[PDB]
Amino acid sequence: KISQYACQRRTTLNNYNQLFTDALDILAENDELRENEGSCLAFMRASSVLKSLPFPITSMKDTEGIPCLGDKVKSIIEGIIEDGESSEAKAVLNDERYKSFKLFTSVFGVGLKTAEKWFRMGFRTLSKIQSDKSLRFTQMQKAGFLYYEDLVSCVNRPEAEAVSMLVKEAVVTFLPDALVTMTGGFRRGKMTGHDVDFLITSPEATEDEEQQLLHKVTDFWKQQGLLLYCDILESTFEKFKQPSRKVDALDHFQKCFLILKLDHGRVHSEKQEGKGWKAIRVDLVMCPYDRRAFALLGWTGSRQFERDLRRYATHERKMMLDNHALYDRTKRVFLEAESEEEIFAHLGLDYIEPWERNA
Ligand SMILES: Nc1ncnc2c1ncn2[C@@H]1O[C@H](COP(=O)(O)CP(=O)(O)OP(=O)(O)O)[C@@H](O)[C@H]1O
Ligand SMILES: [Mn+2]
Ligand SMILES: [Mn+2]
Ligand code: NA
């Protein structure tokens, strides 16, 4: 019996149901754009459970006993079994609002509100947006347009590893005892990603040393001429506050959203070609040493795995979980963890490996 929770499922990158899940992911994305949160959630949960299957669905009988598959979802599956296509997802892919939203938000610095604004102004192409003499762009959007081709091309594993070397070299220069971990999609085993994320923590650093590290590391890269974009968000972390009750929990740790210049010579791949460097989106998070397991768990993802982990903790265990802590409402105590395994054990869950969290 397959659980309704992604945190009680093993979801690996060998997806046998991409025909169904690609269609469900498109329908969920459209519901997000149309502000239909409920329908979005139902399609995301259906897509997630099909991603966990160890075999491809080839008939409607194969869907028996699978949770999170409502009547609307089963109609979509039936249509794909019929002729190998989803008429519903095909209509979304041909919709002008959907096409514009996907295209505009593919730019770093452009979200739902700016994409909607440009659509209602009559824009349909990035060429017309960039060349417009009346539009005003944020510093984030300027970087998004300037490095667009590099950012839209996938970051591969040799590039992610080359970035990891740069991050570690910079970090240990100021904090030699610091632990640097690659998180996000690449930690879940992905071959490619839109960015490279890292968790940084130090067992001996002070509160001030912890606060200054991201400033020191980015100033060092600025001096090197490697910092193409930088936004540092100061910490709002509260050591003794209860974890978030929200569906999508906010992270209060100090973090930075960067664009780094990655020289081709630093990349050890099978394959200078052009300008000799590639712009790479990099996110760095700094957390207190005692919260490193909660931060690692939250930053590893996937987003669906994190949502279900927090939902299971609340509804099944009367626990409150987020990127900073785990609180037991029955025992009235915060639960400590030195590893992700200890968090799973506190929750009464079998340990799910990072490459099994692709929900
Ligand atoms: N810029 C950011 N802001 C907030 N959280 C982020 C973040 N980047 C990464 N994370 C966190 O770490 C996980 C990775 O998030 P994302 O970076 O948005 C992409 P991904 O799941 O890593 O695959 P991809 O970036 O390789 O395509 C998420 O669970 C999220 O909570
Ligand atoms: Mn990522
Ligand atoms: Mn990221
Ligand atoms: Na965007």
Query: Is 358 near ligand 1, meaning CB less than 6 Å away?
Result: no
Count other Cβ atoms within 10 Å, centred on residue 231: 14
Which top CATH class is 1-94?
A: mainly alpha
CA of 84 to the centre of ligand 3 (A): 34
Breaks (C-N over 2.5 A) in the chain follow: 271
Dist. CA 162–CA 185, nearest whole Å: 16
The DSSP result for 89-132, as a single string, is HHHHHH-HHHHHHHHHHTSTT--HHHHHHHHHTT---HHHHHH-
Q: Identify the CATH homologous superfamily for domain 290-359.
A: DNA polymerase, thumb domain (3.30.210.10)
Q: Which amino acid is at 5?
A: Y
d(CA 241, CA 247): 17
Q: Tell me the C-alpha distance between 27 and 135, whole Å.
A: 31
Question: Domain spanning 95-153: which CATH class is it, in words?
Answer: mainly alpha
Would you call 25 a catalytic residue per the annotation? no
Structure determined by: X-ray
> Could you say which of 31, 150, 195, 251 is catalytic?
195
How far is residue 31 from each of residues 72, 164, 334, measured CA to CA in Å?
14, 36, 37
251 lines ligand 1 (CB under 6 A): yes
CATH 3.30.460.10 domain position(s) in the chain: 154-289
Binding-site residue numbers for Mg(2+) are 195, 197, 283
Q: Is 35 left (phi over 0), alpha (psi -120 to 50) or beta?
A: left
* Distance between first and last Cα of the chain: 17
Q: Tokens 């099994």 correspond to what residue? A: 356
Residue 35, Cβ neighbours under 10 Å: how many?
8
C-alpha span between 286 and 171 (Å, rounded): 11
- Find how far residue 30's CA is from the centre of its chain: 18
Which of the 8 DSSP states describes residue 326? Answer: E
Q: Is domain 154-289 given the CATH code 3.20.20.140 in the classification?
A: no
Which 3-state string (H, E, C) describes 218-265? HHHHHHHCCEEEEEEECCCCCCCCCCCCCCCCCCCCEEEEEEEEEEHH
Q: Is 197 a catalytic residue?
A: yes
* Block residue for tokens 């060998």: 14
Six-digit token string for 142: 């300027």
Pocket lining: 354 vs ligand 1, CB cutoff 6 Å: no
- Chain region(s) in the chain for CATH 1.10.150.20: 95-153
Q: For this structure, is 248 an active site residue?
A: no
Residue 201 contacts residue 286 (beta carbons within 8 Å): yes
Assign residue 68 a region (left: φ > 0; alpha: ψ between -120 and 50; beta: otherwise).
left
Tell me where in the chain the CATH 3.30.210.10 domain(s) lie.
290-359
Tokens of 183: 């998180």
